[PDB]
Amino acid sequence: TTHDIVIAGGGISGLFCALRLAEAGHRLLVLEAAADRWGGRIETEEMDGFIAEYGPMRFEPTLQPRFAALCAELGVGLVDFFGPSAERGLNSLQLLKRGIMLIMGRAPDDQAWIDALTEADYMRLRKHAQLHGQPLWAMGFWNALSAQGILSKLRDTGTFYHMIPENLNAAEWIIWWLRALKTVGQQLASIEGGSARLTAQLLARLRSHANVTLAGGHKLVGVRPVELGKPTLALDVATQNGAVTLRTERLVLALPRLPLLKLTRHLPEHVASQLDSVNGFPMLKVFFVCSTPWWSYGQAPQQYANCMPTREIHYFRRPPEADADGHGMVLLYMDRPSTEFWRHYVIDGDRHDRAELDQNGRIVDAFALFVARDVKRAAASEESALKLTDHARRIFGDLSLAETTQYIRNSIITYGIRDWARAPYGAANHGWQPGVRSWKVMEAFKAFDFGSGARNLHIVGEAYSDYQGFIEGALNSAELALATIPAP
Amino acid sequence: TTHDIVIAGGGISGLFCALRLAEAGHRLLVLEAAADRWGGRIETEEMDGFIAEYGPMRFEPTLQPRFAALCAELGVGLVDFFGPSAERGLNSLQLLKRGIMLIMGRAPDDQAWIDALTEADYMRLRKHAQLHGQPLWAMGFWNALSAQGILSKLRDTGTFYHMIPENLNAAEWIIWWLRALKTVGQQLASIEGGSARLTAQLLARLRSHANVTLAGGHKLVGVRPVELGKPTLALDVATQNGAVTLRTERLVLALPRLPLLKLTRHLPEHVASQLDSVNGFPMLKVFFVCSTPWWSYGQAPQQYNCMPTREIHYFRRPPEADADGHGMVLLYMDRPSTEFWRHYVIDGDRHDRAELDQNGRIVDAFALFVARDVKRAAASEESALKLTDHARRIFGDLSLAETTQYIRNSIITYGIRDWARAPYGAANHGWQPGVRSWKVMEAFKAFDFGSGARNLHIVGEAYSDYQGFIEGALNSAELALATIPAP
Ligand SMILES: Cc1cc2nc3c(=O)[nH]c(=O)nc-3n(C[C@H](O)[C@H](O)[C@@H](O)COP(=O)(O)OP(=O)(O)OC[C@H]3O[C@@H](n4cnc5c(N)ncnc54)[C@@H](O)[C@@H]3O)c2cc1C
Ligand SMILES: Cc1cc2nc3c(=O)[nH]c(=O)nc-3n(C[C@H](O)[C@H](O)[C@H](O)COP(=O)(O)OP(=O)(O)OC[C@H]3O[C@@H](n4cnc5c(N)ncnc54)[C@@H](O)[C@@H]3O)c2cc1C
């Protein structure tokens, strides 16, 4: 065949491009490597009636305006989330804010200065802000915080996801934190009836657009200019059937770093040379649904780290105004190196493009043992962070740990695991690297070509965005490229 | 041109192949991507008269017989090393041995069983040893230790490089540790006048062998069979001049995982599909040479959080030859400390050896980190810091900003090697859960593009049966040697 515009990748950014480009009236095609699914890192499975987000769960719409706007324009609402909470002059909580504000030269409690910062200011910071003579775009976040007259000590033990041991671009993670440290963005909200709800609504308005053919099961595996000097692109697309060959005047790669690296030979050196301007962090989620929970409503998230190979362990029960069975659900949410523990419980090598539910008992076998220890210890202490129901407090007192194991192992109705470090994602999210001038990459990536000046290839997505980690970045990224695509 | 046998890679295994193949009488050529140097991961720089090993330092010749033998046959001596030292029935140092011996079903004090274990036994372990129904070749080391009736909890926050958070092949790291846990070893030896001494001696006997042309500055960047079905190989070799094109009847890839992955398109799928059967661990060394040390004459290596490092090792001159009283500090670190320091290599693009005295910012940050710890060590005294009386006092009095500067000034020369960098991509490698090592080593020892020619080979530590050590690199060389007939 032949098409005006191909879009490789049907993730949030792939599709926000497939929308705005339809609304200006182009003949779009959306290749998407996955047969049945759409929205990539957006994953919401229903597990014994619980909404289990294998991908994003909450959002800060005040911070992520363009998210709200794609939510609004699509009829997606946001149920505000009200869920549970959690060496001298250096005596506070988290408050890397001290570290940042020292670097920026302000008072370590100058929260007005922080709340007044614009994107325009963030750009001025990233380009021009220095620390001990060095630009911050050239430094580790970890190094800038450890400098003469900053911190140390540095607690990665404790804290949320600040990517200290990954040592990201100082400027870009000073920027990122100065954002989430504004007074707003405490407004925390789920998406009504799942996060994948947003995927659906975007296809339901992307079906009522005539000039859009959505083509699941299609994976871009090649790109050549047809003739030297000319803008016509040859796309090798492998699919279910077999190895088709599309042609287009404009290809949009809505792909994170790992797919792009698998395409690296088929890309201009000047672009392919920079795909390593970001690192993909792995994250891994495990969900267990328990018949007979040991925790009440409002049991706080813990930071198990030791007790379990996990970072966070999150706790869910059905609303107390329902509870048709009284069941509950546990999220093990983990980064490096806990990810390496669980990685190996995906039974299918070769392919892992979505959660594996109820396919390895060994995942429960290891969840059981780890919790079994902790809930014999929590009965006694009572000053343990594990609330523990009266029913559970007693019955555990009596069972021989080896049986507390089995009680929990039996208790599991359904369980699932998503290892986001696996192809074709290779990461839950990405981070700029020390040395990188993000703005040089984002400009090069938004629009490029094989050497005609055609400006008819694009990269879009979170990975090389100005708001990494969030759908907002994926959206900012889509726009940057949209602006370089004229009407038909 | 055209050659009997090319050997890509002039590291220890590349060269032990270039030797034994000369001694059977082939017309060898050794390509080596590095212009000036040989022996790759073997790196020994002289720093204000100190032997600084950016690569291997010590060795266990009892455990590594084939190392001793290549040392002996080359006139390389080993100065035995006598350097400084270091919840219910679960309260010791090497609860690791507890964990292993639980898995293996023996008594956690069965040290005779351990000392009696042969290679043939290690193979039987690899292939057949199970845990809760699962073969260990299929498990994480971390998972096997955390099992019902083993450990937990697991202290990786202590300990010397056990690769728990890298979660390596349970069987292959049970094997690896059961080796270094023999009493037989622990006999620790440096190499006489540096570790790179062994590189030199191997070229000095590799010069007196007529049928060997050594070609530094040459990097294999492609391999095609000349004709479909026929054993003739086309080598694209980039060099100083430019892009020559050799031909050979037999190519030996003495290369770790990362260069082989850069050649992955030029390799048979059946081989390239398995290069990810191992992980390359990054390690990073920084060396500082200090005018006026702050530490005692037996100051133990520490396990520093306190610094972004894992080990911090302490050196003075043999004080029988100490003409200035100087001392040296080795920051030796794994993930994630590696990420802190890696950014202080001033040359992007290329890093094939240590960068000495090329970034003051490395001292600037060493100073501050130690400056804190040695103001705390003046007072507490309940510290591993054997601080000298001269140092204990003078530090008491100086402000941080001056304690930093005292140390910053004290530094004569400093260096950094980031082994995670091309073309090494790792200080050493580890088998992965799922892998049957023995299936990989058999596939790798000899293969071809489909003729049956059996005229390509992979050799080196990375896919060896003794990962981490030169012994593995040597075991690997042999496996392939055995499949190469005499001329
Ligand atoms: C920090 C550290 C500590 C160590 N400690 C010990 C120890 O205590 N005990 C011990 O026994 N061993 C130790 N070792 C082992 C050491 O790694 C040995 O040198 C050995 O493992 C190297 O095996 P190799 O032959 O694969 O060497 P390599 O150096 O990996 O050989 C590869 C060579 O090929 C080259 N090359 C790469 N690409 C190309 C190309 N395309 N064409 C041509 N040439 C190419 C160069 O990279 C290099 O010279 C240590 C290593 C390190 C780094
Ligand atoms: C653990 C986790 C936590 C998150 N937390 C938050 C959060 O707190 N707040 C927030 O706002 N967002 C969060 N997110 C969301 C994340 O920011 C976005 O979902 C994502 O980054 C944006 O999607 P994308 O379009 O950029 O890329 P992706 O969703 O990765 O899109 C890639 C798509 O390309 C496809 N594809 C098509 N053709 C090819 C091909 N040839 N090769 C490869 N792939 C191909 C598929 O791989 C895939 O569907 C989280 C995500 C995860 C996984």
XYZ file of N, CA, C and O in Angstrom, chain B residues 80-217:
552
model
N 53.700 -14.036 47.469
C 52.606 -14.358 48.429
C 52.234 -13.062 49.160
O 53.166 -12.342 49.562
N 50.936 -12.756 49.278
C 50.408 -11.459 49.777
C 49.844 -11.674 51.180
O 49.009 -12.582 51.367
N 50.329 -10.881 52.139
C 50.032 -11.026 53.588
C 49.416 -9.719 54.078
O 49.649 -9.337 55.233
N 48.641 -9.061 53.214
C 48.050 -7.738 53.488
C 46.916 -7.803 54.509
O 46.499 -8.889 54.921
N 46.416 -6.623 54.952
C 45.490 -6.509 56.081
C 44.123 -7.181 55.897
O 43.707 -7.395 54.781
N 43.453 -7.430 57.024
C 42.378 -8.441 57.204
C 41.043 -7.923 56.632
O 40.754 -8.240 55.452
N 40.268 -7.151 57.408
C 38.878 -6.729 57.087
C 38.348 -5.780 58.173
O 37.600 -6.256 59.062
N 16.639 -14.732 62.699
C 17.869 -14.341 63.454
C 18.173 -15.395 64.533
O 18.591 -15.004 65.656
N 17.967 -16.685 64.235
C 17.894 -17.774 65.258
C 18.822 -18.938 64.875
O 18.405 -19.814 64.099
N 20.031 -18.974 65.437
C 21.141 -19.770 64.891
C 21.563 -19.221 63.535
O 22.073 -20.021 62.730
N 21.314 -17.918 63.298
C 21.602 -17.149 62.043
C 22.412 -15.888 62.443
O 21.911 -14.776 62.187
N 23.607 -16.024 63.059
C 24.349 -14.898 63.722
C 25.873 -15.045 63.562
O 26.560 -15.352 64.577
N 26.383 -14.759 62.354
C 27.785 -14.994 61.916
C 28.146 -14.040 60.761
O 27.334 -13.134 60.475
N 29.332 -14.258 60.165
C 29.975 -13.553 59.012
C 29.591 -14.210 57.664
O 29.102 -13.481 56.747
N 29.841 -15.524 57.527
C 29.596 -16.320 56.297
C 28.483 -17.316 56.596
O 28.680 -18.539 56.435
N 27.359 -16.746 57.030
C 25.991 -17.260 56.784
C 25.790 -17.533 55.296
O 24.786 -18.182 55.006
N 26.632 -17.012 54.396
C 26.584 -17.381 52.959
C 26.802 -18.887 52.834
O 25.940 -19.577 52.246
N 27.899 -19.374 53.414
C 28.222 -20.827 53.493
C 27.056 -21.563 54.158
O 26.760 -22.697 53.750
N 26.403 -20.940 55.141
C 25.197 -21.544 55.749
C 24.199 -21.821 54.616
O 23.843 -23.008 54.406
N 23.814 -20.754 53.898
C 22.826 -20.768 52.803
C 23.166 -21.835 51.788
O 22.306 -22.699 51.512
N 24.391 -21.814 51.277
C 24.808 -22.742 50.189
C 24.593 -24.168 50.686
O 23.922 -24.943 49.998
N 25.161 -24.479 51.848
C 25.301 -25.871 52.362
C 23.907 -26.369 52.768
O 23.639 -27.565 52.625
N 23.025 -25.484 53.221
C 21.588 -25.840 53.368
C 21.059 -26.338 52.006
O 20.600 -27.492 51.962
N 21.209 -25.541 50.934
C 20.716 -25.846 49.552
C 21.253 -27.224 49.147
O 20.459 -28.078 48.686
N 22.558 -27.432 49.323
C 23.268 -28.680 48.917
C 22.942 -29.847 49.865
O 23.344 -30.985 49.543
N 22.259 -29.572 50.987
C 21.729 -30.576 51.933
C 22.769 -31.084 52.927
O 22.432 -31.992 53.708
N 23.982 -30.530 52.927
C 25.061 -30.959 53.852
C 24.907 -30.194 55.174
O 23.984 -29.359 55.283
N 25.742 -30.515 56.167
C 25.799 -29.786 57.454
C 26.485 -28.448 57.197
O 27.478 -28.391 56.472
N 26.000 -27.330 57.782
C 26.630 -26.024 57.564
C 28.074 -25.907 58.083
O 28.573 -24.804 58.091
N 28.695 -27.025 58.484
C 30.086 -27.102 59.003
C 30.812 -28.296 58.368
O 31.680 -28.877 59.052
N 30.492 -28.635 57.115
C 30.941 -29.899 56.469
C 32.196 -29.628 55.623
O 32.386 -30.310 54.600
N 33.068 -28.730 56.100
C 34.222 -28.142 55.352
C 35.083 -29.188 54.619
O 35.865 -28.794 53.725
N 34.999 -30.462 54.979
C 35.769 -31.534 54.307
C 35.133 -31.800 52.945
O 35.888 -31.846 51.957
N 33.800 -31.961 52.930
C 32.945 -32.136 51.719
C 33.301 -31.073 50.676
O 33.573 -31.458 49.521
N 33.338 -29.807 51.108
C 33.697 -28.609 50.287
C 35.102 -28.781 49.695
O 35.277 -28.486 48.486
N 36.081 -29.175 50.522
C 37.516 -29.214 50.128
C 37.762 -30.386 49.169
O 38.790 -30.344 48.454
N 36.845 -31.360 49.141
C 36.962 -32.618 48.374
C 36.325 -32.477 46.981
O 36.498 -33.415 46.167
N 35.605 -31.376 46.708
C 34.784 -31.186 45.470
C 35.704 -30.997 44.256
O 36.596 -30.115 44.298
N 35.479 -31.805 43.216
C 36.204 -31.770 41.914
C 35.386 -30.976 40.881
O 34.188 -30.713 41.114
N 36.013 -30.628 39.759
C 35.323 -29.976 38.618
C 34.191 -30.909 38.170
O 33.035 -30.444 38.142
N 34.504 -32.189 37.922
C 33.543 -33.265 37.554
C 32.309 -33.251 38.468
O 31.209 -33.611 37.977
N 32.495 -32.884 39.745
C 31.433 -32.764 40.777
C 30.622 -31.500 40.531
O 29.388 -31.550 40.699
N 31.315 -30.389 40.269
C 30.708 -29.068 39.956
C 29.758 -29.227 38.745
O 28.622 -28.686 38.762
N 30.190 -29.984 37.729
C 29.376 -30.307 36.526
C 28.125 -31.081 36.944
O 27.023 -30.657 36.545
N 28.289 -32.155 37.728
C 27.167 -32.961 38.281
C 26.221 -32.034 39.059
O 24.990 -32.237 38.989
N 26.771 -31.062 39.785
C 25.972 -30.089 40.572
C 25.140 -29.271 39.586
O 23.895 -29.375 39.657
N 25.817 -28.549 38.680
C 25.243 -27.727 37.580
C 24.056 -28.419 36.933
O 22.938 -27.859 36.974
N 24.328 -29.589 36.341
C 23.345 -30.350 35.531
C 22.166 -30.823 36.394
O 21.022 -30.598 35.972
N 22.423 -31.411 37.569
C 21.455 -32.278 38.293
C 20.978 -31.712 39.642
O 19.866 -32.059 40.026
N 21.724 -30.862 40.345
C 21.290 -30.361 41.674
C 19.989 -29.547 41.592
O 19.963 -28.531 40.874
N 18.961 -29.963 42.344
C 17.602 -29.342 42.435
C 17.410 -28.617 43.775
O 18.208 -28.849 44.677
N 16.373 -27.785 43.900
C 15.929 -27.126 45.167
C 14.429 -26.847 45.061
O 14.056 -26.023 44.210
N 13.630 -27.490 45.922
C 12.149 -27.467 45.917
C 11.642 -27.809 44.513
O 10.718 -27.109 44.036
N 12.253 -28.819 43.874
C 11.768 -29.452 42.629
C 12.373 -28.841 41.378
O 12.340 -29.517 40.333
N 12.925 -27.627 41.505
C 13.458 -26.750 40.426
C 14.950 -27.031 40.277
O 15.641 -27.162 41.277
N 15.523 -27.134 39.058
C 16.980 -27.233 38.924
C 17.598 -25.881 39.310
O 16.941 -24.872 39.169
N 18.827 -25.856 39.819
C 19.424 -24.575 40.282
C 19.879 -23.783 39.057
O 19.775 -22.520 39.102
N 20.262 -24.476 37.975
C 20.614 -23.788 36.706
C 19.469 -22.869 36.250
O 19.758 -21.866 35.549
N 18.241 -23.135 36.716
C 17.023 -22.372 36.364
C 16.694 -21.275 37.375
O 15.636 -20.651 37.179
N 17.497 -21.055 38.422
C 17.058 -20.183 39.557
C 17.984 -18.983 39.712
O 19.123 -19.053 39.304
N 17.505 -17.944 40.375
C 18.362 -16.892 40.937
C 19.177 -17.445 42.085
O 18.621 -18.268 42.834
N 20.448 -17.050 42.215
C 21.246 -17.251 43.457
C 20.472 -16.641 44.634
O 20.318 -17.288 45.667
N 19.930 -15.452 44.436
C 19.164 -14.707 45.463
C 17.914 -15.494 45.850
O 17.608 -15.545 47.036
N 17.246 -16.119 44.888
C 15.983 -16.867 45.132
C 16.313 -18.139 45.917
O 15.631 -18.388 46.918
N 17.316 -18.906 45.480
C 17.715 -20.186 46.118
C 18.050 -19.939 47.592
O 17.595 -20.742 48.436
N 18.770 -18.849 47.900
C 19.167 -18.489 49.293
C 17.933 -18.084 50.116
O 18.014 -18.167 51.335
N 16.853 -17.609 49.490
C 15.694 -16.994 50.184
C 14.598 -18.036 50.329
O 13.504 -17.687 50.792
N 14.887 -19.262 49.926
C 13.889 -20.352 49.837
C 13.438 -20.775 51.240
O 14.154 -20.475 52.243
N 12.297 -21.468 51.285
C 11.812 -22.214 52.472
C 12.964 -23.089 52.992
O 13.439 -23.963 52.229
N 13.428 -22.826 54.221
C 14.423 -23.652 54.942
C 15.870 -23.345 54.569
O 16.727 -24.251 54.721
N 16.147 -22.116 54.113
C 17.521 -21.610 53.800
C 17.789 -20.377 54.679
O 18.040 -20.589 55.880
N 17.727 -19.150 54.140
C 18.101 -17.906 54.862
C 16.935 -16.915 54.870
O 15.978 -17.096 54.083
N 17.062 -15.911 55.746
C 16.382 -14.589 55.755
C 15.674 -14.419 57.103
O 16.425 -14.429 58.088
N 18.112 -10.288 57.057
C 17.845 -11.510 56.255
C 19.146 -11.947 55.571
O 20.009 -12.455 56.267
N 19.195 -11.798 54.237
C 20.387 -11.799 53.351
C 21.089 -10.445 53.452
O 20.473 -9.447 53.034
N 22.324 -10.418 53.974
C 23.169 -9.193 54.100
C 24.118 -9.108 52.901
O 25.164 -9.784 52.900
N 23.676 -8.356 51.885
C 24.486 -7.834 50.755
C 25.070 -6.481 51.177
O 26.075 -6.080 50.574
N 24.474 -5.809 52.168
C 24.963 -4.522 52.730
C 26.322 -4.719 53.436
O 27.019 -3.705 53.581
N 26.690 -5.943 53.851
C 28.075 -6.314 54.218
C 28.779 -6.919 53.013
O 28.366 -6.609 51.890
N 29.789 -7.771 53.234
C 30.263 -8.847 52.305
C 31.006 -8.308 51.060
O 30.803 -7.138 50.647
N 31.832 -9.193 50.484
C 32.752 -9.007 49.331
C 32.114 -9.679 48.104
O 32.277 -10.912 47.977
N 31.393 -8.928 47.259
C 31.068 -9.278 45.842
C 30.599 -10.727 45.663
O 31.336 -11.595 45.171
N 29.316 -10.913 45.942
C 28.570 -12.195 45.968
C 27.424 -12.151 44.950
O 26.793 -13.199 44.761
N 27.129 -10.961 44.396
C 26.241 -10.739 43.219
C 24.855 -11.333 43.522
O 24.316 -12.188 42.777
N 24.325 -10.884 44.650
C 22.949 -11.161 45.142
C 22.016 -10.202 44.409
O 21.169 -10.683 43.666
N 22.167 -8.855 44.517
C 21.332 -7.921 43.751
C 21.456 -7.977 42.216
O 20.741 -7.244 41.562
N 22.374 -8.782 41.679
C 22.488 -9.073 40.227
C 21.800 -10.409 39.967
O 21.583 -10.761 38.817
N 21.473 -11.119 41.029
C 20.714 -12.387 41.017
C 21.191 -13.269 39.866
O 20.418 -13.471 38.920
N 22.398 -13.815 39.986
C 23.022 -14.687 38.962
C 22.475 -16.109 39.078
O 21.759 -16.419 40.046
N 22.814 -16.938 38.096
C 22.416 -18.364 38.030
C 22.751 -19.017 39.376
O 23.958 -19.106 39.706
N 21.729 -19.447 40.116
C 21.859 -20.115 41.432
C 22.971 -21.181 41.406
O 23.876 -21.126 42.280
N 22.926 -22.109 40.450
C 23.878 -23.242 40.367
C 25.295 -22.705 40.221
O 26.190 -23.242 40.859
N 25.477 -21.696 39.381
C 26.809 -21.305 38.869
C 27.497 -20.447 39.925
O 28.746 -20.406 39.922
N 26.708 -19.789 40.773
C 27.223 -19.006 41.925
C 27.245 -19.839 43.219
O 28.041 -19.531 44.099
N 26.450 -20.896 43.327
C 26.733 -21.969 44.320
C 28.106 -22.575 43.971
O 28.961 -22.597 44.857
N 28.337 -22.974 42.715
C 29.620 -23.584 42.243
C 30.757 -22.625 42.609
O 31.685 -23.040 43.298
N 30.655 -21.377 42.158
C 31.718 -20.337 42.216
C 32.206 -20.163 43.657
O 33.425 -20.026 43.835
N 31.262 -20.102 44.608
C 31.494 -19.820 46.046
C 32.049 -21.070 46.740
O 33.070 -20.912 47.416
N 31.431 -22.243 46.559
C 31.973 -23.557 47.019
C 33.448 -23.705 46.612
O 34.129 -24.551 47.219
N 33.913 -22.988 45.587
C 35.336 -23.010 45.157
C 36.148 -22.125 46.108
O 37.037 -22.658 46.796
N 35.830 -20.830 46.162
C 36.567 -19.813 46.948
C 36.399 -20.071 48.451
O 37.000 -19.314 49.225
N 35.625 -21.096 48.834
C 35.312 -21.486 50.242
C 36.115 -22.727 50.659
O 36.017 -23.109 51.842
N 36.860 -23.348 49.740
C 37.901 -24.354 50.084
C 38.926 -23.665 50.991
O 39.142 -22.442 50.803
N 39.509 -24.370 51.967
C 40.634 -23.823 52.781
C 41.873 -23.810 51.881
O 42.614 -22.804 51.921
N 42.017 -24.864 51.061
C 43.086 -25.103 50.036
C 43.527 -23.777 49.392
O 44.733 -23.488 49.423
N 42.595 -23.001 48.826
C 42.832 -21.607 48.384
C 43.083 -20.711 49.577
O 43.572 -21.238 50.593
N 42.759 -19.416 49.482
C 43.044 -18.398 50.542
C 44.560 -18.098 50.542
O 44.962 -17.060 51.106
N 45.376 -18.953 49.900
C 46.815 -18.689 49.597
C 46.856 -17.575 48.546
O 46.666 -17.893 47.342
N 47.045 -16.327 48.997
C 46.856 -15.083 48.199
C 48.227 -14.563 47.754
O 49.106 -14.446 48.616
N 48.385 -14.230 46.468
C 49.671 -13.834 45.852
C 49.484 -12.724 44.811
O 48.665 -12.920 43.896
N 50.243 -11.623 44.927
C 50.454 -10.629 43.839
C 51.387 -11.233 42.784
O 51.838 -12.347 42.989
N 51.610 -10.537 41.675
C 52.593 -10.910 40.619
C 53.795 -9.968 40.743
O 53.568 -8.743 40.815
N 55.016 -10.519 40.683
C 56.311 -9.799 40.869
C 56.363 -8.575 39.950
O 56.364 -8.767 38.717
N 56.406 -7.371 40.538
C 56.539 -6.095 39.809
C 55.388 -5.889 38.842
O 55.653 -5.582 37.649
N 54.159 -6.084 39.345
C 52.901 -5.734 38.660
C 52.189 -6.946 38.095
O 52.822 -7.994 37.959
N 50.907 -6.799 37.773
C 50.064 -7.854 37.154
C 50.300 -7.857 35.648
O 50.340 -8.950 35.079
N 50.487 -6.676 35.055
C 50.859 -6.486 33.630
C 52.252 -7.065 33.365
O 52.617 -7.213 32.191
N 53.020 -7.376 34.410
C 54.274 -8.153 34.230
C 53.923 -9.377 33.351
O 54.613 -9.594 32.331
N 52.837 -10.095 33.672
C 52.410 -11.331 32.956
C 52.131 -11.033 31.477
O 52.370 -11.924 30.663
N 51.610 -9.857 31.133
C 51.360 -9.472 29.716
C 52.703 -9.432 28.970
O 52.816 -10.091 27.905
N 53.682 -8.702 29.513
C 55.029 -8.490 28.926
C 55.693 -9.838 28.609
O 56.002 -10.110 27.431
N 55.868 -10.665 29.643
C 56.524 -11.996 29.578
C 55.892 -12.849 28.477
O 56.635 -13.618 27.841
N 54.577 -12.725 28.278
C 53.812 -13.491 27.263
C 54.088 -12.944 25.855
O 53.929 -13.726 24.920
N 54.464 -11.671 25.693
C 54.868 -11.100 24.372
C 56.346 -11.428 24.079
O 56.705 -11.562 22.882
N 57.171 -11.560 25.128
C 58.637 -11.807 25.067
C 58.932 -13.258 24.652
O 60.031 -13.511 24.103
N 58.012 -14.176 24.965
C 57.983 -15.571 24.452
C 57.122 -15.617 23.188
O 57.236 -16.611 22.461
N 56.293 -14.596 22.941
C 55.441 -14.507 21.722
C 56.155 -13.663 20.667
O 55.544 -13.394 19.621
N 57.391 -13.251 20.944
C 58.292 -12.628 19.939
C 59.260 -13.694 19.407
O 59.496 -13.699 18.186
N 59.731 -14.597 20.277
C 60.671 -15.703 19.952
C 59.945 -16.867 19.251
O 60.636 -17.876 18.961
N 58.629 -16.756 18.990
C 57.834 -17.701 18.147
C 57.629 -17.088 16.758
O 56.901 -16.073 16.659
N 58.250 -17.710 15.744
C 58.471 -17.191 14.370
C 57.140 -17.004 13.634
O 57.015 -16.008 12.854
N 56.187 -17.912 13.889
C 54.953 -18.118 13.080
C 53.797 -17.268 13.640
O 52.632 -17.603 13.344
N 54.099 -16.184 14.377
C 53.107 -15.268 15.026
C 53.407 -13.818 14.633
O 54.437 -13.295 15.090
N 52.525 -13.180 13.865
C 52.554 -11.716 13.601
C 51.509 -11.035 14.508
O 50.301 -11.266 14.270
N 51.957 -10.259 15.512
C 51.114 -9.443 16.440
C 50.767 -8.124 15.752
O 51.684 -7.475 15.258
N 49.495 -7.728 15.739
C 49.027 -6.520 15.020
C 48.068 -5.695 15.892
O 46.860 -5.708 15.626
N 48.619 -4.964 16.872
C 47.935 -3.890 17.620
C 47.243 -2.926 16.684
O 47.471 -3.035 15.471
N 46.365 -2.072 17.225
C 45.633 -1.017 16.486
C 44.594 -1.562 15.523
O 43.945 -0.735 14.842
